[PDB]
Structures are given as C-alpha cells and as structure tokens.
C-alpha cells in the first residue's frame, strides 16, 4: 500500500513516533505506530481499543508490516461506520502485559491527509499574458469547498528556487501576474483542509507542470 | 454568531448529498431489499404553513427526537444486514455512512442547542404519539433518511443558526 | 389566477399534454392540465385523488375554465392542511368512466416555481471580465441561500444565437467574458430552488438590461 506507506512516513516525520492517525477521504481512518522490530508476538503483542463518545469500547484488529526503514509498523483501519467527523474518538493501545502504551483523543476531521491535487495545467491568460493555473482537487474527496491549496512556482536562468502562493479554500485556480518574461516556469500544488472546521497536514505535491513565458 | 460547524452549509450538505445518493441507489432495489420486519421511523413531512407558525422551540423537539428515532432505525437496519447472506451489495456502504453521518449530525445538533431545547420544550405531559410510521425495505428507510435531513433538519438548522445577541 | 396564470402559462407552454403541479410558497400546490377535448366533458368528468404517504386517500375539488385555443384547464387547489413537503404525494386523476388519465408521485418541495429575479444591472469592467452582472432574488422569497440562477446573453440579432450561464445557488452576481465589442447585448436571469432540499422549474426571465460593447 504505497500511498499509505508514504503517508505514514510524512507523519512519522512531522508528528511523533506516538500513535498517528489520519483520514484521506473523511470516510476512513487508520492509526498506526512503528517500533523496533522484535520477534514473534507481532499484532498479538498489543490490543487496540477505541471508543467514540457515548458508545461502547470497541477493538480494532491490528496488522503488522515491514516499514521500508527496517522497523515494524502496527496499523488498524477503523470500521467505516465508526469514522464519524466532529465526534471525540478515544484511542488506547495496550501491550501484552496489560500496560498502556498510547492514549489519545482525536477528532477525525482534524487529522486529514489528503491525496495530492490532480490535473495541474498552466495557460497564458486572455490578452493579459498572465499565467493561469488550474487543477483538480484530490479525487473522490468530499468537502472540497474546504480544501485550500499552496502553489509552488519555480524557474529562471538556472535560478529556479521556488516561491509559495496560498490559495483560498474551494478555489482551484491561481493567477500569477508578476512572473518574469521569456522564462520557463515549473509549478505544483499541494492540498490540506482549512481550519477551524477541519485540520490535518499538507498533502503530497501534485505532478508538476512547466510553462514558458 | 454562527453556532459553529453545523451552521456551515457545506458541512451539513455533505450528509444531505450522501442521503440523496443512498435514497437514489435504493430505488433500483427490487426484491433484494426487505428489512424482513417493520422498523419504526420518524415522520418527515413538513407543512410549511403549520411549521412557520409553531413555537420555534418545537422545531427543536421534532428534529432532535426524530433524529434519535432515525439513528435507532438505521442501527437496527445495520444489524439486520449483518445477519444473513441476503442480496443487495450496495446497501452496506450506504448504511455505514448513515450510521456514521447520523452520529456526526447528532453531535452537531446538540452543540446547536437542539437537545437542550427539545428536552425543555418537551418537559410537560402531552398527547400519545398518535402516528407511528414504519418501513420494511431499505428503500423506504433511505428515502426517509434523505427527506428528514434535507427537510425539517435542514429547516430547523437554517433558522437556529441565525442567532446573534438581542 | 393573475401572476398565477402566467406561471401556469409558463409551465404549460413548456409541458403540454401532461399533468403539471407546482408550488410558489411551499404552503400551496396546484395541479392542473388542459384538455384538447371539449364538449361532453362536464365538471364531473374527472375524479382527482391524492395521498400523502402514510395518510388516507383524499379527493380534491376540481375546477374548470375556458383556456388557450378552444381548450379547458382543469385544476385542483390542494387544501393547505395536506400541502406537506418532504414526503411522497401520490396523485391520481380518473375519468368519470373509471379511465386513468394521470398518475404521479411528487414531492411538493420538488415542484417550486418562483417569481423572476429583479433589479438586474449590467455593467462593464476595465478588465478582461467584460461585463459584470448583478441582480436581486425574486421578491418575497425566503431561503435565498439556496436559490439557483441562470443568465442569458442576447446578441445584436442578425444571428447572435445565445449564451446561457448558470450561477451557483445564492450567488447574485457574475463576470461575463468573451463579449464581442461593437455589440449591444441584452441579459436576463432565471431562478429556481436548488437541490438537495428543493427543486422545481425555472422562473420567467427577469426584465432585461442592455449594454453596448
């Protein structure tokens, strides 16, 4: 599961080796943690329990995996019926001995890691000569009206060293009118949910697009 | 000021569109969608003439309690579905989204003050339910799910959100 | 049946031969039709039955009046007590002979027909957005937040077919582009209650406004 693997890598980086959880399409949730590969007693080594506010404590079958680092990641994918946004989700991981390892309380809508935007295209505006950037939001994702973006624009005489433009949520277009003439530029977009209704971490950058001014 | 999260149309709309798809998809049900029993559901009709004339607090009563009954109806549908190797492959996800969505809406409504208002406006003895609507197919269950959220729920939420200070 | 007649006319003009039902204030409902069959068709020529889901069958008082070109228009003004939305409404029209004329199921909230929007104001833009259009929702009409619009751009005859633009619900202004210069344009705007909560039909066009480019 490349996408999940690569995403769990971002969180491992940005966040803690603690219990990390993230939703991609708001109708899902996976929590996981990595740990110094041991011996036997894999997923059995622990019990992952969760409880959505006002409901009974449930268990979530754990899975073990070979993290492309040399360690082992334990992960659980919440049953879809329990992936409710805006409701306190208490998570708890217990080791074989019965001792608590992790204790978190999250809100699914605040841990979203979106797939990267798709279909990035760059065109020279209508008689303005400006660059108009258009793209599609992460596929199969709801609440697109709440997805803001960040554009990376780089290029120049072997001096292409970026610049970042923040795009309003719901907007999938960006107008650049101060770009240097006769210059081959390269742009890319990344997505993330807008606060305060939502929260999360930057998505992967979209495939790039080059344009000559 | 906008009573947070549910007062954001797009936030509530996510569920209304989910319900529409659920309802739409269950129209091609056939004989593969019986609940094999009568599941009590709320009444979703709204008489706009009577609706805008009744004490606003009563809107709260109707929606909060109706939603509660709805949640129970869907939960029952979920367990009825877990049992058997019965047909209709599409049913599962729509039910999981409904259970999930109804759970979010319930939390969302309370923050809006729906549960508080509903309990007080309903703290005096009244006349027997005198109604009792039911469904025996997932089709009616989902149609009711959509009509309720897009109906009195939306209506109640729209008015309640316009609440500054006076 | 004043502004009513026009509305009735608007729906018939676009849907002849079938049973058309519509509501203007969600507190009302009128189902009707025109007969290209006269003489012998008395007031008891048809029986109009309806049933709100989980409600007992009921009969509606029929009405008749000379119409169009040698035709008659039958109508039923649904008692307000039974004009409830968000619930299936089964309708059945039967000839006095027991013959089935029409049969339908509709949702009152899905057959709304509003008054046309007003105060349209077409203006030019010192930008590539040629003409900026702004308007007002149909007068006396709540829930404005979910009313959808459609603007029409009329050319300077001789040819100039059309240009239909749909305006997202709630939004009462737009930027028109690709407006050829040296041309007199006329723009009008339509309106209709938007899904998923409502539905219905496009209102009559608003009074037009012209502008030269």
Resolution in A: 1.9
Superfamily of domain A15-111: Immunoglobulins (2.60.40.10)
Determine contact, residues A10/A201, Cβ cutoff 8 Å: yes
Q: Which chain C residues touch B if contact means CB-CB below 8 Å? A: 25-27, 52-54, 80-81, 83-88, 107, 109, 143, 145, 195-197
DSSP characters over B91-156: HHHHHHHHHHHHHHHHHHHHHTTHHHHHHHTT-S--------EEEEEHHHHHHHHHHHIIIIIHHH
Q: What was the elucidation method?
A: X-ray
Please tell me which of the candidates B49, B150, B151 has its beta carbon nearest to residue C80. Answer: B49
Pair of tokens at residue B9:
């149309």
The pair of structure tokens assigned to C36 is: 């290209």
Q: What is d(CA B65, CA B62) in angstroms, rounded to the nearest whole number?
A: 6
What's the alpha-carbon Rg for chain A, to the nearest Å? 21
Strand ranges across the sheet with A118-124? A118-124, A131-136, A173-176
Q: Which of B34, B24, B134, B22 is nearest to B81 (CA)?
A: B34
CATH for C112-213 is 2.60.40.10
Q: List the single best residue of C125, C126, C128 to mutate versus A (max A Cβ within 10 A).
A: C128
Tokens of A91: 């998570």
Using CA atoms, how far apart are residues A189 and A152, in angstroms rounded to an integer?
6
B101: closest chain A residue by CA: A84
Cβ neighbours, 10 Å, residue A71:
15
Domain ranges of chain C: 17-111, 112-213
Count H helices, E strands: chain A? 1, 15
Q: How far apart are CA A22 and CA A25, in angstroms?
A: 10
Sign of CA dihedral B50, B54, B56, B61: negative
Across the A/C interface, how many CB contacts are shorter than 8 Å?
5
Provide the residue count of chain B: 166
Q: Which helix (H) or strand (E) holds B63?
A: helix B56-82
Q: Is A153 exposed, middle or buried (0-12, 13-18, 19+ CB in 10 A)?
A: buried
Do the Cβ atoms of C106 and C133 come closer than 8 Å? no
**Domain boundaries in chain B?**
1-166
Phi and psi based region of residue A139 (left: phi greater than 0; alpha: psi -120 to 50; beta: remaining): beta
Q: Identify the sign of the CA torsion A5, A10, A16, A17.
A: positive
What is the nearest CA distance from A177 to chain C, expressed in angstroms?
Answer: 14
Confirm or reject contact between C177 and chain A (CB < 8 A). Answer: yes
B107 and A197 in contact by Cβ < 8 A? no
- Nearest chain A residue to B105 by CA distance is A86
CATH fold label, B1-166: Growth Hormone; Chain: A; (1.20.1250)
Contact B93, B21 (CB under 8 A): no
**What is the distance in angstroms between the Cα of A198 and the nearest Cα belonging to chain B?**
10
With contact defined as beta carbons under 8 Å apart, do A116 and A206 qualify? yes
Same fold, C17-111 and C112-213: yes
In the DSSP assignment, the letter for residue B56 is H
- For residue C177, which residues of chain A lie inside 8 Å, CB to CB? 126
Q: How far is residue A29's CA from residue B77's CA, in Å, rounded to a whole number?
A: 23
d(CA C167, CA C171): 6
Tell me the C-alpha distance between A166 and C149, whole Å: 30
In this complex, do B49 and C53 lie within 8 Å of one another by their Cβ atoms?
no
B5/A80 Cβ within 8 A: no
Q: Would you tell me how many other CB atoms lie within 10 Å of the CB of residue A122?
A: 20
Does domain C17-111 fall under CATH 3.30.70.980? My reply is: no
Q: Which among A123, A124, A125, A126 is the top mutation candidate for probing chain C, defined by the most C β-carbons within 10 Å of its own β-carbon?
A: A126
Helix (H) or strand (E) holding C114: none
- From residue B108, alpha-carbon distances to A77, A87, A100, A101, B162 in Å are 24, 9, 31, 31, 16
- How far apart CA B108 and CA B90 sit, in angstroms, is 27
Where does residue A73 rank: exposed (0-12), middle (13-18), buried (19+ CB within 10 A)?
A: buried
């Amino acid at each position: 599961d490349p996408k999940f693997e690569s995403k769990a890598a971002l969180l491992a980086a940005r966040g803690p080796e603690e219990l990390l959880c993230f939703t991609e399409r708001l109708e899902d949730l996976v929590c996981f943690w990595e740990e110094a590969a041991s011996a036997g007693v894999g997923p059995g080594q622990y019990s992952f329990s969760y409880q959505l506010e006002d409901e009974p404590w449930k268990l979530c079958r754990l899975h073990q995996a070979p993290t492309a680092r040399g360690a082992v990641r334990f992960w659980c994918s919440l049953p879809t019926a329990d992936t409710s946004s805006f409701v306190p989700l208490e998570l708890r991981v217990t080791a074989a001995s019965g001792a608590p390892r992790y204790h978190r309380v999250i809100h699914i809508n605040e841990v979203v890691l979106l797939d990267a935007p798709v279909g990035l295209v760059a065109r020279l505006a209508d008689e303005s000569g400006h660059v108009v950037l258009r793209w599609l939001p992460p596929p199969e994702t709801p609440m697109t009206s709440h997805i803001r973006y960040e554009v990376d624009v780089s290029a120049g005489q072997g001096a292409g060293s970026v610049q970042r433009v923040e795009i309003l949520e719901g907007r999938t277009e960006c107008v650049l009118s101060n770009l240097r003439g006769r210059t081959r530029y390269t742009f890319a977009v990344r997505a993330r949910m807008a606060e305060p209704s939502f929260g999360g971490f930057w998505s992967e950058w979209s495939e790039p697009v080059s344009l000559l001014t | 000021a906008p009573p947070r999260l549910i007062c954001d149309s797009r936030v509530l709309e996510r569920y209304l569109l989910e319900a529409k798809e659920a309802e739409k998809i269950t129209t091609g049900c056939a004989e593969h969608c019986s609940l094999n029993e009568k599941i009590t559901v709320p009444d979703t009709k709204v008489n706009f003439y009577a609706w805008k004339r009744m004490e606003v607090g009563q809107q709260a009563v109707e929606v909060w309690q109706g939603l509660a009954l709805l949640s129970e109806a869907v939960l029952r549908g979920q367990a009825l579905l877990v049992k058997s190797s019965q047909p209709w492959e599409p049913l599962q996800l729509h039910v999981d989204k409904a259970v999930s969505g109804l759970r979010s809406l319930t939390t969302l409504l309370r923050a809006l003050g729906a549960q508080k208002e509903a309990i007080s406006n309903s703290d005096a003895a009244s006349a027997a339910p005198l109604r009792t609507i039911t469904a025996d197919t997932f089709r009616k269950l989902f149609r009711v799910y959509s009509n309720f959220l897009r109906g009195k729920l939306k209506l109640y939420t729209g008015e309640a959100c316009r609440t500054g200070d006076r």
